[PDB]
A paper describes a structure:
Here, we have determined the structure and molecular architecture of the Ty3 capsid by 3D and 2D cryo-electron microscopy (cryo-EM) and compared it with those of the retroviruses. In the case of Ty3, Gag3 is cleaved into CA and NC domains. Similar to retroviruses, the protruding capsomers of the Ty3 capsid are formed by the CA-NTD, while the inner layer, linking the capsomers together, is formed by the CA-CTD.
Adjacent CA-NTD domains exist in different orientations; therefore, we considered a pair of CA-NTDs [one in orientation A (cyan) and one in orientation B (dark blue)] to be the repeating unit, and aligned and averaged the four independent copies of this pair of CA-NTDs (excluding the CA-NTDs from the fivefold position). In this way, we generated a higher resolution 5.5-Å map of the CA-NTDs. We flexibly fit the homology model of the Ty3 CA-NTD into the new EM map. The N-terminal 36 amino acids of the CA-NTD do not have a defined secondary structure in the homology model; however, in our map, we resolve density corresponding to this region. Interactions between these N-terminal parts of CA-NTDs may contribute to stabilization of the structure at threefold and fivefold positions (central densities). In orientation B, this density continues over the top of the CA-NTD and down the interface of helix 3 of one CA-NTD and helix 1 of the neighboring CA-NTD on the outer side of the threefold position (blue density). The total length of the density in orientation B in the EM map is ∼100 Å and likely accommodates all 36 amino acids. In conformation A, the N-terminal half of the density is not visible; it is not bound to the rest of the CA-NTD and is probably disordered.
Author numbering:
A (entry chain A), B (entry chain B): 37 to 110
The structure:
């Protein structure tokens, strides 16, 4: 799953890369529109645990990167 | 089937949650665009049985929740 989800990080950053942004808030809420079924539950809780309106865009990805935890064998 | 369909309730409410709505009518007709093959037949009949244009958004879900009827054994 996560090996696909590692790639799933890559293009969605690359998609919003070439397009502009008027601010930072709508960028971080754009991701959850594409996210998976149990991950969006974590994604919903993660904004509510943030007391401020936004912790910056990479930090949302790193918690999803910390959601990965997957090494292979060989 | 329905154990998946219980989850299928959850995100589609959560998807439209963070997005706005100008009214209530287009929200209830958005669901049937994703619904299953025999369920959309029930979904088509359910609006026609409503004499008024809309009975509110949860009531459509509860009839789908009443469509479930599935307990497990252990």
């Amino acid at each position: 799953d996560s090996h696909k989800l590692k790639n799933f990080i890559s293009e969605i950053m690359l998609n919003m890369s070439m397009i502009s942004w008027p601010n930072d808030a709508s960028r971080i809420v754009y991701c959850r529109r594409h996210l998976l079924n149990p991950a969006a539950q974590w994604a919903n809780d993660f904004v509510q645990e943030q007391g401020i309106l936004e912790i910056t865009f990479d930090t949302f990805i790193q918690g999803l990167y910390q959601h990965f935890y997957k090494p292979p064998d060989i």
